[PDB]
Amino acid sequence: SFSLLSQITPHQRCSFYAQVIKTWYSDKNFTLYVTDYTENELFFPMSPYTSSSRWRGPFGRFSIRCILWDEHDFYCRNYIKEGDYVVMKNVRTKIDHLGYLECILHGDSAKRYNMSIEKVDSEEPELNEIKSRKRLYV
DNA sequence: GGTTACGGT
């Protein structure tokens, strides 16, 4: 089933709709920061006071970092863009060394876990709640 | 498999 981001907990498999806020590519992986405009106590409290950040919101504990490895990296790195909506299915969660939630997509060549990430056209009704909540923070 | 809310590649 699908969860809101406020509902996810560490060390589980989950699926959710979200909007991509930030992407970062490296030679090791591809990173997404995603939000569905619901709060989670385990998310990093994003500060509006940072000098010179390119982040424009949401602020506080409203976004989660996703680390994409292997085929997930190679597929998304020149495809998923900031602002895109995505549906992420059967991804894994963890807690990092500092105690924050993170989402991980490990390579799965064996096709054991049926993981996926795909773009969702902005017009899809599955995104209505994300859009209605975003209005609260603009 | 990586480190820390940036950097803006």
Side-chain angles (χ1 to χ4, degrees), chain A residues 80-136:
Chain A
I80 301 305
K81 304 299 176 187
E82 295 175 357
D84 288 345
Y85 297 92
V86 292
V87 56
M88 305 181 47
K89 299 181 190 174
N90 299 315
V91 300
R92 282 284 299 182
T93 63
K94 62 175 294 188
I95 290 301
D96 71 17
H97 302 76
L98 301 181
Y100 304 105
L101 257 174
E102 197 167 46
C103 170
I104 310 289
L105 289 73
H106 290 288
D108 183 19
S109 280
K111 291 183 169 186
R112 165 65 178 80
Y113 295 114
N114 196 29
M115 266 181 310
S116 63
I117 169 166
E118 296 281 15
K119 292 187 182 190
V120 179
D121 188 281
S122 50
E123 84 174 44
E124 303 297 351
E126 282 79 1
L127 307 176
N128 286 350
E129 292 302 324
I130 286 172
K131 296 184 181 181
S132 59
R133 293 189 294 261
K134 179 179 177 178
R135 293 196 294 266
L136 304 171

Side-chain angles (χ1 to χ4, degrees), chain A residues 53-83:
Chain A
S53 171
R54 298 287 299 273
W55 190 272
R56 298 288 175 269
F59 298 105
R61 300 191 190 266
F62 278 85
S63 300
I64 188 171
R65 182 159 60 214
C66 307
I67 304 295
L68 279 59
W69 297 103
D70 304 313
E71 69 270 19
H72 315 287
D73 170 10
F74 308 141
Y75 180 54
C76 292
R77 64 190 288 116
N78 303 110
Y79 177 59
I80 301 305
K81 304 299 176 187
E82 295 175 357

